[PDB]
Amino acid sequence: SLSSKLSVQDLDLKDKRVFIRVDFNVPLDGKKITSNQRIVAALPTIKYVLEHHPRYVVLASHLGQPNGERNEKYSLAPVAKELQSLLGKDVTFLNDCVGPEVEAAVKASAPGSVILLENLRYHIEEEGSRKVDGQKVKASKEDVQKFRHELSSLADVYINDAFGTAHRAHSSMVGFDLPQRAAGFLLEKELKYFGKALENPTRPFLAILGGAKVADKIQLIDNLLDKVDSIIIGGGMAFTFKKVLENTEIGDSIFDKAGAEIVPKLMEKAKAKGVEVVLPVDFIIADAFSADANTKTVTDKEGIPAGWQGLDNGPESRKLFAATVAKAKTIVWNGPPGVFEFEKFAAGTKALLDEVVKSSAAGNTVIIGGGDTATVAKKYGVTDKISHVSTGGGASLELLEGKELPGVAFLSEKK
């Protein structure tokens, strides 16, 4: 159970050597943080720990893709400075995550110190491999164990707060053999929500899916079909389901050739489980993929003329989706119903967004788990209205498509 794991909140931190794997993978531009969102998100854990007077707090993370080689372009130095400002406490920055220098520095620290180590991925043994000439140069089991040995040396307790990496069995996610591997407030939140949704869902459990390709979400639908009561399929995804199941004439809309092969299968299953599949009955077409393109509403039956392409949810579909949402007690949403980047094609997304929020207002569990689906919530400033906007990215998907997460499995049980 994603929900049975140990929390930071259960740990006895006093005078302990705490190690926290955090997600400080922020965007840099010329060695400067374009977005400090991730640093800000990590603060609660860091602050809660510090209040219990640990001997010291070692923070580690990765940034960009150094590729197991020391590359200045992906140094965590800037991050160290932003955190010091944001935290309002000094942060010692070490040029590495392992070695005598680190050991020394760490050992000479003052109580309550906050050490941030250099980019874990400067070492090939973190990921356990490296790309050289396109091929995957794997690291030797001995070196991998050495690295994990050195890393663990620095701590007495281990806290994971990097959900975004929990789906990889990297040295920092699964190499800490301590008696207590706990969850940080950040990752606990993801575990609590996705936990309920996938374990004891308050039916009806609905799932809104949308976006561009169906091919990337084949494993997602399949698994969810064993879970949900009804599922809505919107966006550029729906065009494949409609041309296949209903012979709908789609114009120059998104068609996933490979995904069309599976559509009958997922549908057979949907029926098998008695899952209610809601699809778009009408769309807003455009003569070109641009904010300045001529629109025109058409429907299921009228179809879409050649040249034209549907870029948003039509009026009837909005009524249809609004209804479905309004009947659910648990909602997990990933993917916008239309090309919301353009105001002309933003109606469907807005309509849906309002409904979901209203459902959250009702006191229903709404879980956003999409990149652009979170951006939508941020844009309309409703983020605080959604029960949970996940930050797991690839980990969130994998979790939803069935997979068991190494970083999560490795944690201790509540006790």
Residue positions annotated with a catalytic role: 38, 213, 371, 394
Is the dihedral angle over the CA atoms 222, 205, 382, 27 positive or is it negative? negative
Cα separation, 185 vs 191, in Å, equals 10
| Residue closest to 197 by CA, chosen among 162, 218, 224 | 224
Within 8 A by CB and 6+ apart from 226, the residues are 273
Cα separation, 182 vs 141, in Å, equals 26
Where does 296-363 show beta strands of DSSP type E?
297-299, 309-313, 330-334
Say how many C-beta atoms besides its own lie within 10 A of residue 381's C-beta. Answer: 8
- Which stretch of DSSP H or E encloses residue 365? strand 365-368
Cα separation, 232 vs 279, in Å, equals 6
Enumerate long-range contacts of 133-140, CB under 8 Å, 24 or more apart: 139/68
Cα separation, 334 vs 355, in Å, equals 15
Cα separation, 158 vs 18, in Å, equals 6
Cα separation, 92 vs 59, in Å, equals 10
DSSP 140-160: PHHHHHHHHHHHHHT-SEEEE
Cα separation, 116 vs 61, in Å, equals 9
